Amino acid sequence: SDLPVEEQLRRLQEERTCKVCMDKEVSIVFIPCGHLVVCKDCAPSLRKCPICRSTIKGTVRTFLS
């Protein structure tokens, strides 16, 4: 793709944005699933990953650069 720019931009914004608050950017990696889908403010409120449903056993704070 090969797809409209604003459509490509929307897809990247979406994958970089928190899946629970739809506001702040992702910054927490779940262990063991490895999803990067929530921000640091939202992570403590979760027992399980929003995407798959693995019970979060650890977390790593990450920075996109």
* Contact flag: residue 30 with Na ion (CB under 5 A): yes
* Contact flag: residue 31 with Zn ion (CB under 5 A): no
Q: Enumerate residues 6+ apart whose C-beta is below 8 A from 32.
A: 54, 57, 58
Nearer to Zn ion, 5 or 22 (CB): 22
Cα separation values, 26 from 19, 22, 30, 31, 55, Å: 8, 10, 11, 15, 18
* Contact flag: residue 59 with Na ion (CB under 5 A): no
Chain residues binding a second copy by CB under 8 A are: 5-6, 8-9, 12-13, 15-16, 19, 26, 29, 31, 34-37, 51, 60-65
